[PDB]
């Protein structure tokens, strides 16, 4: 139970990925649906309108899944690298009643990326059964930029 759930393959459609906000610029759109592992092209990553700790990227599996981990990746423009260094994870069954992922009694601060191309895998112990998943960028270099994948398997 550690297979990609569909971010890179698109088994998870564009409509299923949303965010608190996303950055748009001349001839460019860093929309939520761009947050797919190893994606290439212009504006190939989700970026919030403004970088702050209250932004989030959301994935709706449209069904209950067993999530055993997440894979994060940064992004590089022509020369500058952008990536999330630390992030939190929250989950929900209805998309409104959210619970942060805790570890040993406290909210878990996951260690993310340190460059723009290396994928970093973070396992979830214990795993979670949820329909919705959110990534909360806490720290970053230059810009909050994300390309990701979710690891797990069917609940049934």
């Amino acid at each position: 139970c550690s297979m990609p759930l569909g971010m890179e393959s698109k088994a998870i459609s564009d409509a299923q990925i949303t965010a608190s906000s996303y950055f748009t610029n001349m001839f460019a759109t860093w929309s939520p649906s761009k947050a797919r592992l190893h994606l290439q092209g212009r504006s190939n990553a989700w970026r919030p309108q403004v970088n702050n700790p209250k932004e989030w990227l959301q994935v709706d599996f449209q069904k209950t899944m067993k999530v055993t981990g997440v894979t994060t990746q940064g992004v590089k423009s022509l020369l500058t690298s952008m990536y999330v260094k630390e992030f939190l994870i929250s989950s929900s069954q209805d998309g409104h009643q959210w619970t942060l992922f805790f570890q040993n009694g406290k909210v878990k601060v996951f260690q993310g990326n340190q460059d723009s191309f290396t994928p970093v895998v973070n396992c979830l112990d214990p795993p979670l059964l949820t329909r919705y998943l959110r990534i909360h960028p806490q720290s970053w270099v230059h810009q909050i930029a994300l390309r990701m994948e979710v690891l797990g398997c069917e609940a049934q």
Partner: antibody
Amino acid sequence: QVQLVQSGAEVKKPGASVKVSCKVSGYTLTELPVHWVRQAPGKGLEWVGSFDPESGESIYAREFQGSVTMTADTSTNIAYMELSSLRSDDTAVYYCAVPDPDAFDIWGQGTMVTVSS
Amino acid sequence: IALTQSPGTLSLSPGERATLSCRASQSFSSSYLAWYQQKPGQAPRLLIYGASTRATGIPDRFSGSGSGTDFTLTISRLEPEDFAVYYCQKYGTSAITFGQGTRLEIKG
């Protein structure tokens, strides 16, 4: 290791047309938009227009609406900026620049264009 | 949207803290504000974008802040290499504009 190389200085008479080039190296032109700006002898920066070599879409600055034409040779990775109906007040250094990742991060060396009788 | 810079000419001494302002006609996202530095005979150099993010290679000496209609470029301790002309500007999906510029000279 990216570089934007513009064409040499131009000398033109009123009513003439000048075509400035901007060759990029280290990436495919189509991957990013191309911004154009100029600076008159003792004045500030002024946006002229921007172009998307991927779709061929252009957006002009209010003051340069009907005097600029932007194009690009996708194969040779060269962006072009043609200014027609040149006037003496069009005398300035013209620059191309691309975002990395959002503004005018990388600049060409600039092309001097002098318009006079 | 129009941008207004102040002062026209700022006179300070090396080692001093420099503060430059950029006022906008209408409020807009801080993620569309950039600051550039330009020295004679040279093309402009981007210092900060998104109002507060420094471009790679830019000394920690430079920092930016602000939002809405007021933005600020601050230089903690001025080095002789910092005396030049500074320009702010707003970019975006539909248009870009520049402030008129501020010249930072040495107080002699």
